[PDB]
Structures are given as C-alpha cells and as structure tokens.
Design an enzyme around this catalytic site. Structure first.
Site, PDB file in Angstrom:
ATOM      1  N   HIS A   1       1.712  -6.367  -0.312  1.00  0.00           N
ATOM      2  CA  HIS A   1       1.779  -4.923  -0.159  1.00  0.00           C
ATOM      3  C   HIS A   1       0.621  -4.199  -0.850  1.00  0.00           C
ATOM      4  O   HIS A   1       0.655  -3.933  -2.050  1.00  0.00           O
ATOM      5  CB  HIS A   1       3.123  -4.432  -0.695  1.00  0.00           C
ATOM      6  CG  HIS A   1       3.434  -3.003  -0.362  1.00  0.00           C
ATOM      7  ND1 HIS A   1       4.639  -2.616   0.185  1.00  0.00           N
ATOM      8  CD2 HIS A   1       2.733  -1.862  -0.573  1.00  0.00           C
ATOM      9  CE1 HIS A   1       4.670  -1.300   0.293  1.00  0.00           C
ATOM     10  NE2 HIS A   1       3.526  -0.819  -0.164  1.00  0.00           N
TER      11      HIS A   1
ATOM     12  N   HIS B   1      -2.545  -1.235   0.484  1.00  0.00           N
ATOM     13  CA  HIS B   1      -3.114  -0.405   1.544  1.00  0.00           C
ATOM     14  C   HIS B   1      -4.648  -0.399   1.524  1.00  0.00           C
ATOM     15  O   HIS B   1      -5.260  -0.057   0.510  1.00  0.00           O
ATOM     16  CB  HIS B   1      -2.608   1.043   1.390  1.00  0.00           C
ATOM     17  CG  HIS B   1      -1.116   1.193   1.463  1.00  0.00           C
ATOM     18  ND1 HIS B   1      -0.476   1.695   2.576  1.00  0.00           N
ATOM     19  CD2 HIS B   1      -0.144   0.939   0.555  1.00  0.00           C
ATOM     20  CE1 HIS B   1       0.824   1.747   2.351  1.00  0.00           C
ATOM     21  NE2 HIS B   1       1.055   1.295   1.130  1.00  0.00           N
TER      22      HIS B   1
ATOM     23  N   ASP C   1      -6.674   1.647   2.873  1.00  0.00           N
ATOM     24  CA  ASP C   1      -7.167   2.994   2.602  1.00  0.00           C
ATOM     25  C   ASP C   1      -6.875   3.438   1.174  1.00  0.00           C
ATOM     26  O   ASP C   1      -7.211   4.561   0.779  1.00  0.00           O
ATOM     27  CB  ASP C   1      -6.598   4.004   3.612  1.00  0.00           C
ATOM     28  CG  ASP C   1      -5.086   3.890   3.799  1.00  0.00           C
ATOM     29  OD1 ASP C   1      -4.538   4.669   4.605  1.00  0.00           O
ATOM     30  OD2 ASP C   1      -4.442   3.037   3.165  1.00  0.00           O
TER      31      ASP C   1
ATOM     32  N   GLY D   1       4.588   6.498   4.559  1.00  0.00           N
ATOM     33  CA  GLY D   1       4.564   7.949   4.538  1.00  0.00           C
ATOM     34  C   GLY D   1       5.670   8.521   3.674  1.00  0.00           C
ATOM     35  O   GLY D   1       6.244   7.824   2.836  1.00  0.00           O
TER      36      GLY D   1
ATOM     37  N   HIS E   1       8.576   0.747   4.419  1.00  0.00           N
ATOM     38  CA  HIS E   1       8.608   1.338   3.075  1.00  0.00           C
ATOM     39  C   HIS E   1       9.971   2.046   2.990  1.00  0.00           C
ATOM     40  O   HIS E   1      10.230   2.988   3.747  1.00  0.00           O
ATOM     41  CB  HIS E   1       7.525   2.419   2.895  1.00  0.00           C
ATOM     42  CG  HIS E   1       6.156   1.904   2.571  1.00  0.00           C
ATOM     43  ND1 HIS E   1       5.357   1.265   3.494  1.00  0.00           N
ATOM     44  CD2 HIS E   1       5.403   2.038   1.454  1.00  0.00           C
ATOM     45  CE1 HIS E   1       4.167   1.038   2.963  1.00  0.00           C
ATOM     46  NE2 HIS E   1       4.169   1.499   1.727  1.00  0.00           N
TER      47      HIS E   1
ATOM     48  N   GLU F   1      11.733   3.535  -2.188  1.00  0.00           N
ATOM     49  CA  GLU F   1      10.729   3.744  -3.226  1.00  0.00           C
ATOM     50  C   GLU F   1      11.142   5.009  -3.971  1.00  0.00           C
ATOM     51  O   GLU F   1      11.287   5.011  -5.194  1.00  0.00           O
ATOM     52  CB  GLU F   1       9.341   3.939  -2.601  1.00  0.00           C
ATOM     53  CG  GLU F   1       8.199   4.052  -3.612  1.00  0.00           C
ATOM     54  CD  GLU F   1       6.845   4.319  -2.956  1.00  0.00           C
ATOM     55  OE1 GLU F   1       6.789   4.474  -1.715  1.00  0.00           O
ATOM     56  OE2 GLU F   1       5.832   4.375  -3.686  1.00  0.00           O
TER      57      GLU F   1
ATOM     58  N   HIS G   1       8.821  -1.827  -1.635  1.00  0.00           N
ATOM     59  CA  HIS G   1       9.475  -1.281  -2.831  1.00  0.00           C
ATOM     60  C   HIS G   1      10.978  -1.599  -2.819  1.00  0.00           C
ATOM     61  O   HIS G   1      11.420  -2.577  -3.439  1.00  0.00           O
ATOM     62  CB  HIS G   1       9.262   0.238  -2.922  1.00  0.00           C
ATOM     63  CG  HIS G   1       7.822   0.653  -2.864  1.00  0.00           C
ATOM     64  ND1 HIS G   1       6.943   0.461  -3.908  1.00  0.00           N
ATOM     65  CD2 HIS G   1       7.098   1.210  -1.863  1.00  0.00           C
ATOM     66  CE1 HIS G   1       5.741   0.880  -3.553  1.00  0.00           C
ATOM     67  NE2 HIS G   1       5.807   1.338  -2.316  1.00  0.00           N
TER      68      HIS G   1
ATOM     69  N   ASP H   1      -0.372  -2.082  -4.310  1.00  0.00           N
ATOM     70  CA  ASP H   1      -0.107  -0.903  -3.476  1.00  0.00           C
ATOM     71  C   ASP H   1      -1.388  -0.109  -3.145  1.00  0.00           C
ATOM     72  O   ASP H   1      -1.913  -0.202  -2.027  1.00  0.00           O
ATOM     73  CB  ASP H   1       0.922   0.016  -4.165  1.00  0.00           C
ATOM     74  CG  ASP H   1       1.663   0.920  -3.182  1.00  0.00           C
ATOM     75  OD1 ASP H   1       1.488   0.753  -1.959  1.00  0.00           O
ATOM     76  OD2 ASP H   1       2.440   1.796  -3.636  1.00  0.00           O
ATOM     77  N   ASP H   2      -1.875   0.678  -4.108  1.00  0.00           N
ATOM     78  CA  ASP H   2      -3.090   1.485  -3.929  1.00  0.00           C
ATOM     79  C   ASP H   2      -3.967   1.420  -5.182  1.00  0.00           C
ATOM     80  O   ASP H   2      -4.057   2.391  -5.937  1.00  0.00           O
ATOM     81  CB  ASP H   2      -2.727   2.951  -3.669  1.00  0.00           C
ATOM     82  CG  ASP H   2      -1.994   3.152  -2.358  1.00  0.00           C
ATOM     83  OD1 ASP H   2      -2.650   3.216  -1.298  1.00  0.00           O
ATOM     84  OD2 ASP H   2      -0.751   3.246  -2.392  1.00  0.00           O
TER      85      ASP H   2
HETATM   86 ZN   LIG Z   1       2.750   1.118   0.077  1.00  0.00          ZN
END
Ligand SMILES: [Zn+2]
Length: 349
Positions: A12, A14, A16, A181, A211, A214, A235, A292-293
């Site tokens: 998991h 992203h 972006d 999202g 997702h 979370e 999550h 994640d990010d």
């Molecule tokens: Zn995510």
C-alpha cells in the site's frame, strides 16, 4: 541501520504520494508551472506534514505539486521509474504501487484534475507510460513491481474506465483495482459507479482492494467486504469497532494493509489508544506494513518499521511473519507468488 534490514514486501503506497521533490522541481520549471517553493528541502517541508491536518488541508498538499507532473508524458514515466529506485533503497523486493490514472491525465477525464488546461494525455496512455517506467525500473533496480489502478470515491463516473484499464493492462504490472479518496462521504462505498466497477472486477478476475476503516466507521469496511467484495483492506483500523465483523474477517484471513506512520500523522489513530497494528499483532491478524504517501509523510519504509520496533516492541519474528503474509496476500499470479515466497523463506531462513 534499518529496523528490519531484510527483504520486504509493500502493498500500500501511492505513486502520486511517492515522488522526489527534486523531480517535482525539475518538471515545474521545465514547463513553467508555479510551485510554492523553489528548493527541494523547503518543498518537502511545505508538502510534508508533521501534525494531523483537516482533510481539506491534506488534499490541498496534492494541489501544490500534481500540476507539475500530470499531463506530461516524460514526467509520468520518470516518477514511475524513480519510484522503483526508492523502493530498492528501502530493501523492498516486491511492491504493489497504486494511483489514479485519471489524476495524471489532461485529455478525456471530464472533471479535468488540478485545474490544468485540456491536453492530449488520456488515462489510458497514462497507464502505459507508468507501466513502462515501472518495468524499466524493475530491470534496473532489482525490485519486482506490479501496479493497482485507483477508483476515486468522489468520482464514481471514472470507475468503469478504471476496471477496463486493469483488464487491458493485466499482468503488464496492473494486478488489481482500488477505491481511494474521502471515506467520510456518506454512501460513497455504495455509489452505483463503484459497486458496478467491482462487480466487473470479480467477473473479469481483476483482484480487489479498498480503502476502508481508515477514518470511516466499521460500516464502510463491511460495505467494502460484502458489497464491493474486496480481497484486502486499505488500513481497515475501524474494523475493531464491530467485533463480529472483526472476528469474521480474522476467520476469513482477510488482509489488512497497515500504514502506522501515516495513521499517526493523519490522526486516523489517536496516540492515547493502543495502535491497531499492535492488536493485529497480538491477534495474529494477516497484515502488512506500508508507507502510504512517503512524500507527504516525509518518510521511508524504515520509518514504519522503526516505529513498531522501538515504540511498539515488534520483534524480527513478527516482521518476518507479516512480510510472509504480505507475499501470501499479494495479487501476483500463484506461480510468481510462490517464487516470491521462496525468496522470502530463504532470506528469512
Ligand atoms: Zn492509501
């Protein structure tokens, strides 16, 4: 020194949300795109977060840099390539990277993202460019890489296109479909556009993750499993609020894609309570550790392992355990999945 200096599996993260600030800076100036700062360090300082932010504040982080990448073929391919390199430095041997093809396009996509001008980059071509970057990266950095296309909760209208892209580029890195999202959107999981895209994924053998849980209630998790028929949960922390659901999911060996550092910074997890990953560990749940990010959270995979090791007492046995389960829960063909497992077993034994 890494907390777990052994091969790892990440499910998991992203694309972006995992870009080098230098690369963002390079493309920003290359085509005259306005960026908040002109230096790498201050750019990640601006884009990154050190404390929980409102959703709007969180989402706005993307508005700051996505315009510099979206719509540019060279950039789409490059961030995919550099992403594999980042993972290689993390000691990751297999990674499933996800992203919304639509959020990187400027052609087609009715709601043109990032207020960018109508261009010539369609979601379909975006996927091919990402595929290319990921494959060249796999060849150059020694990391097995597959991708996952994301449906966006607020844009059900894009979901059918997402599943058809997964089918079109299957095996060519694309192995699953996701739903990301704002989860607080009432009934978003039930939006016809999302439900139908997943029903089609099941019909076409496209793997599924969603997702859920979370920040949303245990109810969004339930909707992800019973209606969207997801195979894994992004999550899924709030599943612990519905005990029977939690127990059924444990019985089913459902996989939870955990992101510890992320959960803290976003506030998804309240520091005053036992972290979900701790009980999942105590309950021997099937879960993985994920960034994640990285860009937004100013982290690397080691950040999450350092956190669980030092602040939660995770042992190397648990780290080996969870990565084996991550591999077992991957969306890789059975053939390749076994090979990945053999690598991990030999590396962990
Ligand atoms: Zn995510």
């Amino acid at each position: 020194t890494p907390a777990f200096d052994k091969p790892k599996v990440e499910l998991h993260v992203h694309l972006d949300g995992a870009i080098k600030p230098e690369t963002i800076l390079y493309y920003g100036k290359r085509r005259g795109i306005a960026l908040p700062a002109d230096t790498p360090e201050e750019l990640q300082n601006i884009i990154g977060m050190d404390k929980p932010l409102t959703l709007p504040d969180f989402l706005a982080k993307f508005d700051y840099y996505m315009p510099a990448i979206a719509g540019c073929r060279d950039a789409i391919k490059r961030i995919a390539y550099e992403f594999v390199e980042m993972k290689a430095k993390d000691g990751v041997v297999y990674v499933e990277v996800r992203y919304s093809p639509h959020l990187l396009a400027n052609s087609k996509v009715e709601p043109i993202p990032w207020n960018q001008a109508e261009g010539d980059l369609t979601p379909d071509e975006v996927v091919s460019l990402v595929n290319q970057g990921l494959q060249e990266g796999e060849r150059d950095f020694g990391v097995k890489v597959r991708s996952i296309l994301c449906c966006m909760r607020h844009q059900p209208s894009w979901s059918s296109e997402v599943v058809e892209l997964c089918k079109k580029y299957r095996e060519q890195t694309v192995v699953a479909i996701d739903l990301a999202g704002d989860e607080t959107i009432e009934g978003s999981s039930l939006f016809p556009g999302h439900v139908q895209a997943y029903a089609e994924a099941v019909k076409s053998g496209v793997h599924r993750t969603v997702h859920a849980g979370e920040v949303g209630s245990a109810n969004v998790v339930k909707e992800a499993v019973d209606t969207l028929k997801t195979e894994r949960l992004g999550h899924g922390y709030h599943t612990l609020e519905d005990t029977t659901l939690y127990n059924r999911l444990r019985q089913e060996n459902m996989h939870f894609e955990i992101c510890p550092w992320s959960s803290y910074l976003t506030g998804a997890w309240k520091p005053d309570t036992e972290h979900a990953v701790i009980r999942f560990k105590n309950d021997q749940v099937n879960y993985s550790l994920n960034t994640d990010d990285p860009l937004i959270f100013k982290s690397t995979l080691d950040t999450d392992y350092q956190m669980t090791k030092k602040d939660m007492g995770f042992t190397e046995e648990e780290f080996k355990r969870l990565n084996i389960n991550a591999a077992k829960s991957s969306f890789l063909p059975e053939d390749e999945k076994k090979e990945l497992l053999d690598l991990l077993y030999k590396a962990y034994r």
